Amino acid sequence: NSVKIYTSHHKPSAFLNAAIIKPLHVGKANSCNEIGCPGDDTGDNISFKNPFYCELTAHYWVWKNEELADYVGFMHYRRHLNFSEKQTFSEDTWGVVNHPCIDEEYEKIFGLNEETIQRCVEGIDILLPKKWSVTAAGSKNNYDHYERGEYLHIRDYQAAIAIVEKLYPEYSTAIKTFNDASDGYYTNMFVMRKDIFVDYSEWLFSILDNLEDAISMNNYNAQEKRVIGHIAERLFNIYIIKLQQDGELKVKELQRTFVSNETFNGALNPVFDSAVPVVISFDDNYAISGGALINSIIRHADKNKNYDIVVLENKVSYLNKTRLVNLTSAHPNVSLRFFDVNAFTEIVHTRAHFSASTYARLFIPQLFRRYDKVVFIDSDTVVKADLGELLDVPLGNNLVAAVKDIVMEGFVKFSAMSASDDGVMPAGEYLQKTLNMNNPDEYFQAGIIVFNVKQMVEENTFAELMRVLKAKKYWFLDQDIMNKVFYSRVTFLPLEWNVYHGNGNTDDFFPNLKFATYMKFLAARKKPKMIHYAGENKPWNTEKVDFYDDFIENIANTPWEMEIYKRQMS
Amino acid sequence: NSVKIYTSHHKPSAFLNAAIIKPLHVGKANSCNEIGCPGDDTGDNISFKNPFYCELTAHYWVWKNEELADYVGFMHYRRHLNFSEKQTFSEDTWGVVNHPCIDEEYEKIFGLNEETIQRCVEGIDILLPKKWSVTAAGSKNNYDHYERGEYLHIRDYQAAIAIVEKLYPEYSTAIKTFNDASDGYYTNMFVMRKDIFVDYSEWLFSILDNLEDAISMNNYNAQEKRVIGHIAERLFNIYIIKLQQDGELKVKELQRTFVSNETFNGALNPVFDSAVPVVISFDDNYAISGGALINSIIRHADKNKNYDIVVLENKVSYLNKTRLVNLTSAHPNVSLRFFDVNAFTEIVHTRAHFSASTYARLFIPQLFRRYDKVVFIDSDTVVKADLGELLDVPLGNNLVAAVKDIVMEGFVKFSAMSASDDGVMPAGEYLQKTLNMNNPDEYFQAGIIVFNVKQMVEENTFAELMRVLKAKKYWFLDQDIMNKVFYSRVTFLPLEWNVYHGNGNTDDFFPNLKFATYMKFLAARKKPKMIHYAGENKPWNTEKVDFYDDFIENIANTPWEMEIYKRQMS
């Protein structure tokens, strides 16, 4: 006895833990993002039709590409079926059983595990939710319910009915029965036997193929455009009624569940067996900076290495996401994927308000927990060397590798006033008291960090990062949080890997540091391995900036090239 | 007995049918165009001096590079010699025999064939036109005729006379005879014996070489600049008179002909043994679009294939033609040639007025009749794939391969009013009645067409295209003409080969088509093989356009790159 049930996701959303539930990113052919599960857009598929077919694209993809278990099923991502013996849970106005979020109790009480689902499907042909009555909604019957639909047009359903009549004359009585009935299964959520699934699939999609030739939309909006999926809900009933009229059919109606709070529990998988994982975070307004950075990474990439680039994007435009991927198209050793950074607000929480993008670095050990090591780099940078050699630096059981922050070194030396929830104090005292660093001199800059993810997973560093995030607001936000949590667990990278470009004036601050540090800064400027445009004067704005040619070099011959001229003509 | 006579052409112009007449494109080194015959600019040549030497560049090229027949001759492209027995044809005020155009009767009555020319040259040393008298023009003698010339300066002829005297003292009496005579052969049109041709060539060009050192032009205009050719007309007489004074010389004076109506009957020959012939048509204002297209063709070209690109140009600037060829300079497998599209107005005519560029596609089976198959593509496109795979599509005896026009599909479905000489009617009725298409749904788009030229040659499809062009004016011009003539002889290419970019709004028209067609349009947009910027909003104008990066990608790093910025700053 084998069961495989598929859940349809369109954004980062919690996954069920049972191995028999397979999540699918439906409509992935139209998405530039990853959500942590395979898409419906591999092999023989109709993923691009998801705006119109809805979850039928998952149905189609499983039908054409999956090795079918003895039972094949489909559920929504926040709406599932109750497979447990207790079918007496409190239901509401719509007949659904509500549960706050997807947790271990949710999967236990609703029987969302292999053992409970297997006993529920024992000698049953089809499992599905309870019928819903159209007479309460004011409709006379199921046919009239389609016609009165706010976003429905009966001519589309009439066209589908004629096709069933022509292609399958033996269904005419089943069509009449459903259309004149006052109830039915208004759902695409079911579990049915392998042989019934194949027969229904061949039957349903033969009708839908002809339906595409028989109807034409008339300025349909997003809801009306789902006409195909809406029609398939009626065909589902016509098909079942025909099976019941022919002979036996054992149907088990189950309760429906609803999850009121969306969460995210997934993770990104590596795309190569061995690669240099590079993590960048920016919104649409910094997409130009991210393009130059990614182009700089490609230009200094080792031909014999692979590069797994993941952008934690905050509403980057579809155009910019397309342009960014197009930078990697000619390079099979360079992958670029996008993840909605805003999923981090609902992973383990601080119920105060905070920006997922502002604190994105804190979530690297969780999202990338399947990686051994990962290199984060600020988006306002360009590299002058292979980022892969950062992966070769021996880390031991240190949590991170990073560059010592010489700007903070100046803040401590010159008694710059800090600002946080603990008041206002010199930066040196702030580092010792608030950040609990016995040596404030070990403060590292967060513009480039090699995460020892494997060690963070063993120590559950992520839970500590969240705890520190909850406790108070810090002067330099996640940079302060990571300096506190990673203290005495930091490998120090040479200054060549994080060279400040100096803003408009580089001679005002750095020459007044410790002489040895100033010498290290002067030597690093002469052969940088990464240039950090940290500050107010960005190269995509003024041109009158140190290392400005290094930025232009990587933005020339990209779609952002002509943007820089207008964006610079103040 | 062998005869080879060469005709000098500088633009598309009719060729004589006899195999012994060899057409030459004189001054081809200064031209960017092909006219359908070899140039005077291969091997040892002086083609660039054609503005000054005139037809002497053809003389020089034959002298240095051709295997000389027993008789070598030269004629103009619309002025020839009468080799027939009848030398009594009606002549006019200037002593020329006029004939409307070059046809089969013209070549028959004036003996322009191998048999008649061979009997005319039997025991003759030199054949040439009748002498012309300078006394009727008001001149005292041949010397005075040069001095009184409107665009002549006697100091140039005096310089040439001194050179003949110094280099060839034995010519002094022949110089005096001609200069004091009142008549002579004012022509460069002759047929002479192989040995006389070589001797005259060595003699004439030895003088002209020294003449270049002895004269200097003084702000000469185009007519004055022909001083070398004008002087050679006098030297021709001095040379002949010397031969007659030394001993025997048998001269046969023939009548001159003139062709009052210029036509074109040539064809372009393949430049590779096997290649992908690509035909594009545009004027100078669309040269930027053509550059992006040609660059896109190069960028997606197969290294193991050859590409024979021919641009039917309508007064494209010399600068733009140079820039376009320079796109192919680094690619020995890509050829680019230009042909004046305006020659199509005088090929088989509709004596109404029409634009050669507007109807250029109709003339492809005639100009390219020596090709088996040819791919036409609109100039407002860019390709995303190798155009060579269009040549691999099985055509059978179909006349063309093209993409079904989904815009016309919408016009028929939505009863768009047509406009032609047959009035105003719905597009569906217009397609059935005016275009005689039993199924209006097979209407194909003309933005990319694989011509089965070999089949069109066998069926003489070109004559039918011209007949249909004469009959009436059509709603979509040559697209309608080709849909009518090619009906039921069309292989349908997948929509990926002609993807509309959608202008500024792509959601207004296409979603209201047949649902199956809209799905095909959505799938084709996701991986286009050719992008068609058909419509009002062109990417070289607004930037705010779908597939705009695909156009910029191919115009970047070309001489038109900075043009796009000023042309877009409205």
Next chain:
Amino acid sequence: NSVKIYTSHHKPSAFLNAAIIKPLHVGKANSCNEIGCPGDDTGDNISFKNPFYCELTAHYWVWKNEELADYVGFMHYRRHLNFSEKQTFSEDTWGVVNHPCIDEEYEKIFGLNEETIQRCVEGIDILLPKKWSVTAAGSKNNYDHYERGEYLHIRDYQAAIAIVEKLYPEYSTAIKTFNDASDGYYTNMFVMRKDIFVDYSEWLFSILDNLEDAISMNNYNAQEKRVIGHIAERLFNIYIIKLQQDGELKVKELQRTFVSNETFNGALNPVFDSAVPVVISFDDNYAISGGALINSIIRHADKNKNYDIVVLENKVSYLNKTRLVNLTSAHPNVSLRFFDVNAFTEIVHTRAHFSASTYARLFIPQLFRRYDKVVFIDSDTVVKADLGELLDVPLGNNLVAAVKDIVMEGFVKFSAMSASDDGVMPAGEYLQKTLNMNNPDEYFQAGIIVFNVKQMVEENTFAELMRVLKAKKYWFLDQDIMNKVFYSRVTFLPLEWNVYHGNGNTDDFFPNLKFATYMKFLAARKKPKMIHYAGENKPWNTEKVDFYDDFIENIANTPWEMEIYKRQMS
């Protein structure tokens, strides 16, 4: 007995002739220029610290990288030590012996040769200048002299004293002796024994290493920034006093010299064993033109050849010099070096005023006297071919190879009025009388010249060029000087190697030349090997210029690309 003494140079400056004196370009890591000697920036070095360590960078470099002779010494570039027996030369207010310039008498009287220096160091441990008294300057002792220093801060010297005390407790009495003394060796100029040099080096730089950690500058200016070098002058005395207190030490105090007139006598050495030496000259305002030229040279370079490019720069910006070198970074067969052209004013002089850049070509046989042949090219050019084939042209004992000047050919033919110190006369008479050219037609253009340097060295052509430069001012400056001196010693290059772009109007002047010359000009324009943008309308200014695309082609995808748009938007 072995002696090696090093002199510190920071700009083009005269070198001592004795083989035992080794010149060093100190701080070369911060310079983009060559001055004719090795730098302090190879191997283990601190060259970038030269703004702070001063000549200690030469000391450090010799210590870490040189095979030390029995005696190691250091002198300034215009201040040396008197090694001769006579130590009684007239000294001035500061105790230095002045000499006008570095000549053979200077090296003789002050014993700056191997023989005199060897006898001076016979049984001596350390040689150095006379002590200087701080009491005359108003100081109480050597400690107080540091504190009262205008650009000195005693806290820095106090920090160095504490380090000597901690690291070397045995020096406390030597520290007290020097600090309380009223005199000492305020110098970094010395010669000492090999073993004393190593011990002092390990001692001095161990202190300076710790000093970098113990001090921090406070908005120091250029003079204050030399704190390290200033402190080392005191440590030098502390170290010597300790050696004298421990036991024996034989010290020989020598007189100091000063050279009041700076000269230059060096030469550039080849960087490859075999290469194409290319010499260009421009200031910062023509750096854009030089970038396009150098890029054109790279684009047409033979992969199997090396290219030794030297720019005689006249205050080209640091940014532009960096951008120019960056053009060669991806090309290991192309070297780019810079030399300050202004050193030519002090090589052999005309004590009138003249511009080193205006007459830079005249100095090629002197600066490049170690090359066999050298190709000069104007900066307002782009090449269309490998410059290396100019080196293959047989020169014999001719002094130069160049292109005949057809513009001067027109000036002579049209009696253009010359202008020089000899008055105003037709150009033909000027060429014969002032330039002493029996045939004015052999006048060559100076925009591209192959110098036969080896022949010029044998004939001392440079001395003649200088003599002619002194005598009078010429119409076309160094072009006239070189035409006079190189007359009848010129190999004539084909016109394809120096094609005028024609300014805005090319049809006004050239068609009126000798006809043969005009034909040569028309043929050269059709396939140029070098395009000369000589004149008023430069391609980086107007766009409306012949061969404009040839210039843009080489400036596109460089940092000057966006400069051209603003510089052209008038």
